[PDB]
Design a protein around this ligand. Structure first.
Ligand SMILES: [Mg+2]
Ligand SMILES: [Mg+2]
Lengths: 61, 189, 132
RNA sequence: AACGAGACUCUGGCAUGCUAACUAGUUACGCGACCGGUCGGCGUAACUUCUUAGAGGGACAAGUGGCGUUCAGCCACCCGAGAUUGAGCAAUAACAGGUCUGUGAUGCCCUUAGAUGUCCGGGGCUGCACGCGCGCUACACUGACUGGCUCAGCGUGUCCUACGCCGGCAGGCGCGGGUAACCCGUUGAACCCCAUUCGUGAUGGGGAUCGGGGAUUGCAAUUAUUCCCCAUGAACGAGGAAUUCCCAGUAAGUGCGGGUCAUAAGCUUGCGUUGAUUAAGUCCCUGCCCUUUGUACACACCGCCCG
RNA sequence: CUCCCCUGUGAGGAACUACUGUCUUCACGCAGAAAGCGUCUAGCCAUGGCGUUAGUAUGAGUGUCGUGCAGCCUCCAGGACCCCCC
RNA sequence: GAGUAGUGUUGGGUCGCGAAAGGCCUUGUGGUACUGCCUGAUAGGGUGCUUGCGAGUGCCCCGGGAGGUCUCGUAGACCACCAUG
């Protein structure tokens, strides 16, 4: 299933070369579920991310 | 009233996604007459989030060496490309830019992890601005590679690649590289 | 990154400390105050120092500043500090006390005090933190 | 508290407020022209917006709102010309860095009248089976050509060069101005902009290598100094392992000035013009810095030292 | 345990020719894959690039023939609904 | 009736837990909290769910009633080359 996500906070930048941003995800379905997630490119708080695999969790690079 | 290239209408177009609604421009205000505003959008972070999308497609079309400094080559080429598009599909050519941006942009992408020389990639997910940017990149590069020597006008070949990027066909070089990114994303997960 | 030199902050400290009455919360006000009060070369020095005199005043009206001592804000903090509620917090009709405290008072012949109330001793003994 | 960082000097951005300009223009009025205007066309009063350049103002994280031991300071917004202008100068120390070849700046050595001196005439630094390096130019359709339309700035000049006339083109002749905001010079530079011809092939893309001729410079050009006309028209199909430079009037394209210069910029040093993609983050790599730590080293790991 | 709002392709009609848009068949050029097989590179090693499979297997579109697919009416279904469960 | 009957145990005890039949002799308390499950009391001992975590909040039985994606915060990040000067 395809899902949507909301940015609650920006925590740090994960990467070897300092590539990924490690961001915190609310679900736009009004659910309270909170998952950390890796995102590439620029991110500011409040943005919406589209997840193709929505059950996956964030690991440290 | 504000009419793009004198014959178009910006305010009637539509955005179907929430992520790309906050970034993609030329809906409410930003709609201009001509692409070249010579403004500074690289001044501060995300200040280039707000510049006109047509200008955004415009800026990226100078991207190879001899064409580099010449901007007007583009506001020429983007001029004839739109006027071509309206003849084929028959819709507001600025709907075709929206759909090509929305569809061509990656969703998930791979970040290289390992030691140099050994590529082992892990799947992460694209940020909205990054989606827009990569998408447009893909559009301009697809147009170049497709138009190098087929003796096609870049007007003709970009209208081609844009309409095809909008429909979702594998004709577009864009949709191709996207589909590869998402598939590698699948490989890893 | 915009950060003030030792010169800037030291100067604005002494300027404020001497002239505290003449400065005001406006920038150009104290800018022209410092074109007079002190002697500074150039401009970008002047402007910065004054900016800090100002900033430091906006922190002064909040309360005591670590760097400066003025008798005027010593006096305003003599007003602010001095306070008292209509009755003392040390006045209660009933003050509760442990049997032993009552004993210690009984040594001093105060076992006759009226306001006292003897409260029940706590039966378990655990005052200690479970080591580990 | 002191030096280093900053401050500072030099450059760019602001000023319809000031000081003014016949060696810069403006507005106004005349004459001039061709159909009320258009004109770098000609002259007088009007003044500083333009054009210069002096004085001094202006920005100080300032104002508001967020993150902060509400502390530094960090983010967003407004008010604004400007919320990051680009260079110079550079401590305590050192390198056994480059410099007898920039010095009438030298300590030694050698040379000293068939001179390692100097001047004269030629040759040589330029040579060619090969490696390694900056840099130019291209691989074409966002392109080549052909006509047409309107743009810069820094500087250079007793040599820059106005206008004629002869010259297909390079060039000759001549007659003129300027030690320069006066004369070259309204510096009509290149892309770009508008029409035209070309049609995916070693093609008009690319032009090396050559064979003839004209003209310049110079005593002197053969070992083509350069420039110019015809021909000759070859490699080259976006470049393997590796790697270099770069964050905003910036990368890059594009011409232009100064240096070298009798004649010369594929170099340098500056100058404008057209003008972006992406990041506002991290120590992975590379590089140096601190801190802790071990040391039998201190001429300091190119150390010390055991048979 | 339902009922009834919108989606489907299961059956009947008009229409089907005229209307428009999509799947059939032929000429057309354009992108264009892999199982694998080899090679090169990460000190050793493909989970990568590049060669060969092949410009195959394919897919997006323009013009030919369809007597198609349809759009307009019904249900048979499927999902939003409810309930219910919490 | 009777803390008897019955029932129950580590060492004992003057025991712990705790009935009913039936009568008699005339009322035969109020106020006020809570309450997941297990064991053995609203005590003692284990053990939980609500949002990954930390807070809150709720979780005995019945009837009826309506109102519903409980609220606030939030790092929760973990997958051997090499002598000498
Ligand atoms: Mg490192
Ligand atoms: Mg020693």
């Amino acid at each position: 299933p395809i899902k949507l996500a909301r940015v609650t906070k920006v925590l740090g930048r994960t990467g070897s070369q300092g590539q990924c941003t490690q961001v915190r995800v609310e679900f736009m379905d009004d659910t309270s579920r909170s998952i950390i997630r890796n995102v590439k490119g620029p991110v500011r708080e409040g943005d919406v991310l589209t997840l193709l695999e929505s059950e996956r969790e964030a690991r440290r690079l | 009233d504000i009419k793009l290239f004198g014959k178009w209408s910006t305010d009637d177009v539509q955005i179907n996604d929430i992520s790309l609604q906050d970034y993609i421009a030329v809906k409410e205000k930003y709609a201009k007459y001509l692409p070249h505003s010579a403004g500074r959008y690289a001044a501060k972070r995300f200040r280039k989030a707000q510049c006109p999308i047509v200008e955004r497609l415009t800026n990226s079309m100078m991207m190879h060496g001899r064409n580099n400094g010449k901007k007007l080559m583009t506001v020429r080429i983007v001029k004839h490309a739109f006027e071509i598009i309206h003849l084929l599909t028959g819709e507001n050519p600025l709907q075709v830019l929206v759909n090509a941006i929305i569809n061509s942009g990656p969703r998930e992408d791979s970040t290289r992890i390992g030691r140099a020389g050994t590529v082992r990639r892990q799947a992460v997910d694209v940020s909205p601005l990054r989606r827009v940017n990569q998408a447009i990149w893909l559009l301009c590069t697809g147009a170049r590679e497709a138009a190098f020597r087929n003796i096609k006008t870049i007007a003709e070949c970009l209208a081609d690649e844009l309409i095809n990027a909008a429909k979702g066909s594998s004709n577009s070089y864009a949709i191709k590289k996207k589909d590869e990114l998402e598939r590698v994303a699948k490989s890893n997960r | 990154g915009r950060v003030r030199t030792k010169t800037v902050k030291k100067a604005a400290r002494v300027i404020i400390e001497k002239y505290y009455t003449r400065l005001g919360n406006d920038f150009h006000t104290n800018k022209r105050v410092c074109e007079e009060i002190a002697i500074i070369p150039s401009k970008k020095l002047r402007n910065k120092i004054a900016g800090y005199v100002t900033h430091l005043m906006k922190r002064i009206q909040r309360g005591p500043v670590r760097g400066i001592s003025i008798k005027l804000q010593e006096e305003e903090r003599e007003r602010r500090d001095n306070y008292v509620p209509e009755v003392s917090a040390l006045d209660q009709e009933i003050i509760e006390v442990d049997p032993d405290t009552k004993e210690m008072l009984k040594l001093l012949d105060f076992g006759s005090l009226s306001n006292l109330q003897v409260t029940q001793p706590t039966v378990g003994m655990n005052f200690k933190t479970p080591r580990g």
